[PDB]
Design a protein around this nucleic acid. Structure first.
Lengths: 255, 257
DNA sequence: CGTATTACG
DNA sequence: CGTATACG
């Protein structure tokens, strides 16, 4: 079994100050995917770039201190691709696609659509660009694992206040429909394979102290292509790991 | 009666508020509180910071957002408050309040820091010149004056822990030290030194080197009076245990009648 | 070091 | 609420 953890850390330097490395060394994932690092490698301490027993990969945005994704792994991939082949989507530090032979691992920080209509439109086009790429690979016979911050709660069970958020980016009908479509394209929301409970969230607003009252949203997911779903042994939420407004999520994969 | 004035370069009034400023303020209960480097306009402050029970507040922010700025809280409001010397470049940086309490004028002044450039050192020195013309005109007209705030210069070698290594650092340049000498010769008295002639008495310490815990400091904050008023000064002291900023507060007590 | 700026979330 | 250039 291989353990993969995904975490939108909302600042890698920030979580580092809070004890990221202590947590990392206790949890011992085989592969760790991070989103929203808000750093390029040259701004990171050495102990963050060089972690014992892991190869690290950093894919920053062009804009300083914005977005960015990272991957640490005990076995290195045979390749790592950092975009879809579309400039506007490939320069925000949102995409790592690592080839582990048994599977391709997509580590994706999907755009947030809250700030503006243009950014909602960018988010939905990113979604489409993502789906084209992953389908190309799956069709070629590759098995695929996708984790990261999708920035959308899929169904009503996936946030504490569905009614109030019907017109808020993150629970818009159009966004929820893209996830339906993604699933209908042959992919499985792994957490829902094992847990059909409500109150299971991965993000809580800092602003209203939402975490202590568990007023959250499930924005972070592990998906696999349906042909690969038999190899998924566990999908869970690391609810109690603090340090970010998102908590980590986990996947156990056989082979 | 006995009047207590406290001066404090807070380095962010919202910051000190978050650290317990109002609690300290209620404990100390000065008659007048002068603050420098508030880094805020009144609209950025909560209502309870704008209006403290028993005090009237006067905020004089810089044109630039979150930069500089001075404020004053007083139990008895002044008859008038002037917010400049009448020189535009000196009057737009939120550095000047001149309040008339009838018995005296109180200047609450955040003097400029000259460390960043030659341009800003020249600015500081010209601001010193404009300040001296102002206070002299008021004094010459028959007013007693109290001047407090952050002068941004340690006067003598006793006024900082490391005088030699700062001989060419703004804050301890011969030209700056000489200006304080000149201000004094114009008929003004550094009140702290009326009562305390010891070394190790400082009001500012660098955050960057954790200087405060080793007391590697500078005396940058002062209360001056015109010499004719000095017999009214009962005490002048440093509130060195009061945390929350890289400066500590200073105090003056005066007795009128 | 630490408090502001503005952008983003 | 909190994590990402200017001044001091």
């Amino acid at each position: 079994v291989l353990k993969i953890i995904s975490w939108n850390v909302n600042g890698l330097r920030a979580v580092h100050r809070k004890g990221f490395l202590k947590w990392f060394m206790e949890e011992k994932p085989d592969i760790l995917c991070l989103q929203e690092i808000k750093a390029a490698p040259e701004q990171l301490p050495r102990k963050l770039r060089h972690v014992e027993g892991y190869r690290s990969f950093f894919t920053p945005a062009e804009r300083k201190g914005y977005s960015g994704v990272a991957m640490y792994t005990k076995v290195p991939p045979s390749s790592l691709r950092e975009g879809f082949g579309v400039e506007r989507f490939d320069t925000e530090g949102r995409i790592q696609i690592a080839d582990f032979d048994d599977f391709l691992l997509y580590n994706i920080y999907f755009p947030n659509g809250k700030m503006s209509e243009e950014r909602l439109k960018y988010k939905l086009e990113f979604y489409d660009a993502f789906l084209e790429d992953v389908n190309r690979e799956r069709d070629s016979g590759r098995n695929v694992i996708i984790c990261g911050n999708f920035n959308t709660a899929h169904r009503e069970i996936d946030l504490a206040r569905p009614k109030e958020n019907s017109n808020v980016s993150g629970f818009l009908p159009v966004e929820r429909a893209w996830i339906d479509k993604f699933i209908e394209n042959g992919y499985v929301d792994t957490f829902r394979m094992f847990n059909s409970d409500p109150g299971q969230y991965t993000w809580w607003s800092y602003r209203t102290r939402a975490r202590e009252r568990n007023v959250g949203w499930r924005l972070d997911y592990f998906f696999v292509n349906e042909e690969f779903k038999g190899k998924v042994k566990r999908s869970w939420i690391l609810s109690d790991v603090m340090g970010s407004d998102h908590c980590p999520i986990g996947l156990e994969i056989e082979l």
